[PDB]
Write a protein that binds this ligand. Sequence first.
Ligand SMILES: COc1ccc2c(c1)COC/C=C/CCCCN(C[C@@H](O)[C@H](Cc1ccccc1)NC(=O)O[C@H]1CO[C@H]3OCC[C@H]31)S2(=O)=O
Ligand SMILES: [Cl-]
Ligand SMILES: [Cl-]
Ligand SMILES: [Cl-]
Ligand SMILES: [Cl-]
Ligand SMILES: [Cl-]
Ligand code: NA
Lengths: 99, 99
Amino acid sequence: PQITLWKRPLVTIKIGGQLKEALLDTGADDTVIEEMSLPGRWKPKMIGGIGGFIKVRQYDQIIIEIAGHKAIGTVLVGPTPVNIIGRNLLTQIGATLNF
Amino acid sequence: PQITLWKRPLVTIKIGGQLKEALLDTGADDTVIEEMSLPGRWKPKMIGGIGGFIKVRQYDQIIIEIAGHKAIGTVLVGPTPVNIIGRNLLTQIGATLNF
Ligand SMILES: COc1ccc2c(c1)COC/C=C/CCCCN(C[C@@H](O)[C@H](Cc1ccccc1)NC(=O)O[C@H]1CO[C@H]3OCC[C@H]31)S2(=O)=O
Ligand SMILES: [Cl-]
Ligand SMILES: [Cl-]
Ligand SMILES: [Cl-]
Ligand SMILES: [Cl-]
Ligand SMILES: [Cl-]
Ligand code: NA
């Protein structure tokens, strides 16, 4: 699609068989999702957002569908105000910015 | 242009007579610039991202030039770690997300 920005670019994602809503976020290096269970081991990660730094759980090689496009990559889990799809997975679905 | 997302989508902006680098950020509702003075009236606001909230000054009707394209709208000024061009000005330069 071509998504304009007059409203938030929210899409449906599917992770662990569950549908969720997430924000396509070109200002995020990383994908960050609200507390949920994911398989496998996780590693520690700190991310610095507008308000300061938080701890998250980094799960690698997670299968996630984004607006009907399949991706497999790193998902950070932690107390983000909104689920966000960052550039690590926007590149996997072929997204670009255009003007 | 078409901007891929392998790297942060940074562009040069001109605001308040100053040249700065800023992130084209589809996950930001509004534009947030590091501390600087701007002319005119402002009012305080709180915005809440990863890491929590910061207090900013809201200036309305500010003209920016974004990668050579002029736009006018609200700019929030405050202790953001990165300058951000959010949706309120991305719409004005006709930016879309495409995949
Ligand atoms: C009202 O106008 C607003 C304007 C901006 C924001 C909000 C409201 C707050 O809007 C509420 C939404 C919050 C959820 C997502 C955060 C949205 N935000 C934009 C988002 O793109 C930030 C932009 C940024 C970039 C660098 C540093 C600070 C901030 N990126 C970010 O947090 O990414 C994290 C995950 O990947 C990592 O890579 C970059 C840092 C880290 S925000 O800054 O909190
Ligand atoms: Cl869960
Ligand atoms: Cl990844
Ligand atoms: Cl200044
Ligand atoms: Cl505006
Ligand atoms: Cl339009
Ligand atoms: Na003003």
